[PDB]
Design an enzyme around this catalytic site. Structure first.
Site, PDB file in Angstrom:
ATOM      1  N   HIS A  24     -50.833   1.988 -25.015  1.00 39.77           N
ATOM      2  CA  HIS A  24     -49.855   3.068 -24.910  1.00 39.77           C
ATOM      3  C   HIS A  24     -48.851   2.813 -23.793  1.00 39.77           C
ATOM      4  O   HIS A  24     -47.709   3.279 -23.871  1.00 39.77           O
ATOM      5  CB  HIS A  24     -50.563   4.408 -24.711  1.00 39.77           C
ATOM      6  CG  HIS A  24     -50.790   4.771 -23.279  1.00 39.77           C
ATOM      7  ND1 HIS A  24     -51.797   4.214 -22.521  1.00 39.77           N
ATOM      8  CD2 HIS A  24     -50.149   5.646 -22.469  1.00 39.77           C
ATOM      9  CE1 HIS A  24     -51.762   4.725 -21.303  1.00 39.77           C
ATOM     10  NE2 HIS A  24     -50.771   5.597 -21.245  1.00 39.77           N
TER      11      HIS A  24
ATOM     12  N   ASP B  25     -56.749   2.004 -28.000  1.00 42.70           N
ATOM     13  CA  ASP B  25     -55.714   1.834 -26.984  1.00 42.70           C
ATOM     14  C   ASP B  25     -55.966   0.503 -26.283  1.00 42.70           C
ATOM     15  O   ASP B  25     -56.491   0.429 -25.171  1.00 42.70           O
ATOM     16  CB  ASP B  25     -55.717   3.007 -26.011  1.00 42.70           C
ATOM     17  CG  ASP B  25     -54.478   3.044 -25.134  1.00 42.70           C
ATOM     18  OD1 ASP B  25     -53.455   2.438 -25.517  1.00 42.70           O
ATOM     19  OD2 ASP B  25     -54.526   3.686 -24.064  1.00 42.70           O
TER      20      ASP B  25
ATOM     21  N   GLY C 103     -51.591   6.943 -11.899  1.00 42.09           N
ATOM     22  CA  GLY C 103     -50.800   5.744 -11.675  1.00 42.09           C
ATOM     23  C   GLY C 103     -51.475   4.412 -11.938  1.00 42.09           C
ATOM     24  O   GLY C 103     -50.799   3.412 -12.198  1.00 42.09           O
TER      25      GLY C 103
ATOM     26  N   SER D 132     -53.036   3.105 -14.478  1.00 44.47           N
ATOM     27  CA  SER D 132     -53.331   3.007 -15.898  1.00 44.47           C
ATOM     28  C   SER D 132     -53.502   1.554 -16.329  1.00 44.47           C
ATOM     29  O   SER D 132     -53.049   0.618 -15.665  1.00 44.47           O
ATOM     30  CB  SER D 132     -52.225   3.660 -16.723  1.00 44.47           C
TER      31      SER D 132
END
Ligand SMILES: *[C@@H]1O[C@H](CO)[C@@H](O)[C@H](O)[C@H]1NC(C)=O
Ligand SMILES: *[C@@H]1O[C@H](CO)[C@@H](O)[C@H](O)[C@H]1NC(C)=O
Ligand SMILES: *[C@@H]1O[C@H](CO)[C@@H](O)[C@H](O)[C@H]1NC(C)=O
Ligand SMILES: *[C@@H]1O[C@H](CO)[C@@H](O)[C@H](O)[C@H]1NC(C)=O
Ligand SMILES: *[C@@H]1O[C@H](CO)[C@@H](O)[C@H](O)[C@H]1NC(C)=O
Ligand SMILES: *[C@@H]1O[C@H](CO)[C@@H](O)[C@H](O)[C@H]1NC(C)=O
Ligand SMILES: [Ca+2]
Ligand SMILES: [Ca+2]
Lengths: 64, 46, 241, 144, 301
Positions: free
Chosen positions: C41, C90, C184, C186
């Protein structure tokens, strides 16, 4: 407790023989060795006298 | 032999300082009637 | 990342940052050769030439100009059955471009990270480490790299309900501890060590829910379920089957 | 390649199918031929994997080999027949959900005679060469 | 105490499942199932072997891989093939065809010899019944006691297998002396006919039934590691992996990664018998040593 298997693998000891079988008769002693980094008064000896595995030296153990 | 400690398993004593424990400690513990107690662990010499 | 210490050169070699034109967004993990494991993503932008990949990032807006080697991005690979609503599947791969003189990527500093083959490799209550370029509290502290220890927790369907899927996701959070990777950081690595201290990529930072202390632990898409997906593209890779 | 009706020995097959371009070497059987206006699809079941490449096999499963309609006439592929097929890795086409094979410029397509047909004396030479080929490729392979 | 897991049983893992145990050198892992690899994909650093079709293969790995692809082509003799050499195992003095006394006719020697009872275990039991026509290995609950059988000879063969082999030609064979010869190898191959439970079923994946105490003890009683890939804790002296597999006790500090996690070989600081067609089980561990090695997760440069 039925000598048809290998001796009880101790926590702080190690075996000394070849032990390339599985069933053992007649007082087949098992001399354990003190693992590296441990001290003792001598070789801890376990015996299979028919019926059960027993400890020949109770008061002797491998300390750090 | 039997019933004795092997030579290689005996650690000889070697620490024989005439003076040691040259350390510095601060008393930062919560006071009790103005006294702050500090428990200090030390290893004795040979 | 919240509670944690400043990473320095030697620690967590497998960490890889990905920086866009507008600052730094997320970051992946290097698993050897010319391949990177990130979240799908975050990089779903298909503007591949503008993307940048940094390694041995240390501490940002300074660096050690010496071994701060960065590599370009050649190719993107997104998971097809990726769902944007439930954040399933993902996962994404990054192929790094290298000059024609030397074939494949020669990265002598960062150390590759092995890939799990079975969901039974790691269990809950294990000491895992999440590291990335994230936000403590809510501060835009995406300047220094923070790392901290987390534990995997079992049966996450109690806390998130319909949004969690145990086949394709995994939860990591500390009981009574507020140390929780959030926002933040990720796409980052969820690294856990075995008895041999072999370093595995159990998951990568997929989604979560507004940080939130030990109430709602971080959610990571489980890598072991997508073992055949990664192996298919990279040609039966580093790790022993 | 149409390399047949010439001196199609055993060394030739080993030399051509061992080139680095050739990724996979399969023995397939033509299950169904769906003729279309755009493409031609040959749904074939890979009976034996002489050399494996990108696609990982089960034996029993099927894969579709797509080819332009202009080529239908050059090699009339009939159902219930077998073939020795090898090709490049560049002949792949699809993510994985619809992964097809392309009979391209470097795709070897030879007719494989049935077991009752190998007892016949016209297919004798080809049968002996093909059986040996499979054996050598599986156990010994390509020298690399 | 709940030693068996419920969620794992739905999958019925076998020795072909990567999610519990390593594959064999002649196999790779694909989608959690060990699938046969091609013969040319084996490492080429080994010794020649002979199969049942009297065909020579360059190394041991290729013979097992081709046996994997085309089943039935078992193992025969170490080295090149022999014209009249043949390996045979029979059951003598048996009341039926599924029991009796173990006899082995080696490829080397013409003489058919017997087996000691001290060297006999479940590892060699299931592999014995396999090449005899019993697909479900040997039976654990049933033992064949003699009818006070008079034995004349004293020669015995001391046997050691792993458990997943396909014939007793693969395992090491050593000849030993036995005074009086009170040792006596017996065997009871499992008899099929499907049944109903009671009786502490503990069903195998292959369909064999054994006792409660036989599962999750480190012993492969099913023959395909079915009572071992589904454990929360081991019964006897077996060691437990983080995954949930129970391994034998001598598998610790043996020089081979057994658990998929690998916790059995950490912190490890820890022979006149002779010849007869050389051990292939050791060659299995040697081939695993020649698998793709390379760095991953290394602390040092
Ligand atoms: C392990 O998990 C149990 C619950 O499954 C929990 O009670 C225990 O505190 C955990 N221990 C550690 C060290 O995490
Ligand atoms: C596991 O999660 C479910 C939610 O789907 C919950 O109902 C159940 O109580 C949980 N298990 C335990 C032992 O609490
Ligand atoms: C890694 O090895 C060291 C021993 O020096 C120790 O921390 C431990 O045994 C290993 N670490 C883990 C997490 O198992
Ligand atoms: C097999 O071992 C090495 C490679 O592992 C090879 O160099 C050697 O020549 C081989 N052994 C023999 C006896 O040829
Ligand atoms: C038999 O095989 C073993 C192991 O592969 C090997 O060491 C030995 O040299 C072989 N014997 C002969 C005569 O080839
Ligand atoms: C066993 O057989 C041998 C060879 O026939 C013979 O010499 C020996 O006497 C026999 N022993 C007994 C107890 O019959
Ligand atoms: Ca068992
Ligand atoms: Ca081991």
């Amino acid at each position: 407790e039925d000598c048809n298997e290998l001796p009880p693998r101790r926590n702080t000891e190690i075996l000394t023989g070849s032990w390339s079988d599985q069933t053992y008769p007649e007082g087949t002693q098992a001399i354990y060795k003190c693992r590296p980094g441990y001290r003792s008064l001598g070789n801890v000896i376990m015996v299979c006298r028919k019926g059960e595995w027993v400890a020949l030296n109770p008061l002797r153990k491998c300390q750090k | 032999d039997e019933d004795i400690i092997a030579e290689e398993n005996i650690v000889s004593r070697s620490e024989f300082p005439e003076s040691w424990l040259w350390n510095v400690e601060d008393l930062k513990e919560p006071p009790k009637n103005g006294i702050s107690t500090k428990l200090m662990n030390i290893f004795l010499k040979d | 990342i919240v509670g944690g210490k400043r990473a320095q050169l030697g620690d967590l070699p497998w960490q890889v940052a990905i920086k866009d034109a507008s600052g730094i967004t997320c970051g992946g993990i290097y698993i050897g050769g010319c391949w990177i494991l990130t979240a799908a993503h975050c990089l779903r932008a298909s503007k591949t030439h503008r993307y940048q990949i940094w390694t041995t990032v240390v501490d940002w807006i300074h660096p050690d100009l010496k071994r701060i080697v960065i590599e370009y991005v050649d190719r993107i690979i997104f998971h097809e059955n990726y769902n944007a609503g439930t954040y399933q599947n993902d996962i994404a791969l990054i192929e790094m471009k290298k000059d024609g003189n030397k074939k494949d990527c020669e990265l002598p500093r960062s150390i590759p990270a092995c890939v799990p083959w079975s969901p039974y490799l790691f269990q809950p209550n294990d000491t895992c480490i999440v590291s990335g370029w994230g936000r403590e509290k809510d501060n835009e502290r995406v300047f220094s790299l923070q790392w901290g220890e987390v534990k995997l927790i079992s049966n996450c369907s109690k806390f998130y309900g319909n949004r969690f899927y145990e086949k394709e996701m995994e939860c990591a959070g500390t009981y009574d501890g507020s140390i929780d990777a959030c926002k933040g950081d990720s796409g980052g690595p969820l690294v856990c060590m075995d008895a041999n201290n072999v370093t595995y990529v159990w998951g990568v930072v997929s989604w979560g829910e507004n940080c939130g202390k030990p109430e709602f632990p971080g959610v990571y898409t489980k890598v072991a379920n997508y073992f055949d997906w990664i192996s298919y593209h990279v040609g039966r890779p580093f790790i022993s089957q | 390649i149409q390399k047949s009706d010439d001196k199609v020995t055993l060394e030739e097959r080993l030399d051509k199918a061992c080139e680095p371009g050739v990724d996979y070497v399969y023995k397939t059987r033509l299950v169904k031929v769906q003729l279309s206006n755009d493409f031609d699809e040959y749904i074939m079941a890979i009976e034996q994997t002489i050399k494996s490449g990108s696609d990982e096999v089960q034996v029993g499963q099927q894969r579709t080999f797509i080819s332009p309609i202009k080529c239908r006439e050059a090699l009339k592929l009939e159902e219930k027949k077998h073939y020795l097929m090898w090709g490049l890795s560049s002949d792949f086409w699809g993510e994985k959900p619809n992964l097809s094979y392309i009979i391209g410029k470097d795709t070897w397509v030879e007719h494989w005679p049935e077991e009752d047909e190998c007892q016949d004396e016209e297919n004798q030479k080809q049968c002996q060469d093909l059986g040996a080929f499979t054996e050598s490729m599986v156990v010994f392979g390509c020298p690399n | 105490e709940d030693l068996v897991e419920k969620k794992c049983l739905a999958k019925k893992y076998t020795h072909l499942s990567c999610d519990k145990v390593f594959c064999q050198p002649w196999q790779r892992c694909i989608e959690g199932t060990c699938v046969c690899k091609l013969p040319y994909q084996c490492p080429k650093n080994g010794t020649a072997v002979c199969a049942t079709n009297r065909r020579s293969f360059p190394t041991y790995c290729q013979q097992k891989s081709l046996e994997c692809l085309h089943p039935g082509t078992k193992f025969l003799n170490n080295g090149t093939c022999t014209a009249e050499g043949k390996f045979s195992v029979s059951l003598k003095h048996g009341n039926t065809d599924s029991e009796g006394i173990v006899e082995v006719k080696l490829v080397d020697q013409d003489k058919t010899m017997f087996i000691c009872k001290s060297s006999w275990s479940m590892r060699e039991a299931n592999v014995a019944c396999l090449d005899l026509g019993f697909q479900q290995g040997a039976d654990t609950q049933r033992r064949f006691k003699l009818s006070d059988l008079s034995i004349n000879s004293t020669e015995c063969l001391h046997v050691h297998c792993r458990g997943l082999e396909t014939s007793l030609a693969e395992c090491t064979f050593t000849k030993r002396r036995t005074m009086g010869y009170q040792d006596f190898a017996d065997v009871v191959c499992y008899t099929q006919k499907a049944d109903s439970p009671m009786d502490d079923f503990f069903q195998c994946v292959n369909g064999k039934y054994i006792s409660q105490m036989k599962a999750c003890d480190g012993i492969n009683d099913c023959g395909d590691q079915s009572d071992e890939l589904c454990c929360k804790a081991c019964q006897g002296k077996g060691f437990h992996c983080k995954s949930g597999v129970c391994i034998p006790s001598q598998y610790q500090c043996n020089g081979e990664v057994d658990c998929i996690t690998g916790e059995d070989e950490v912190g490890c600081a820890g022979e006149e018998t002779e010849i007869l067609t050389a051990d292939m089980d050791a060659e299995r561990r040697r081939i695993k040593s020649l698998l793709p090695k390379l760095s991953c997760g290394v602390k040092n440069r």
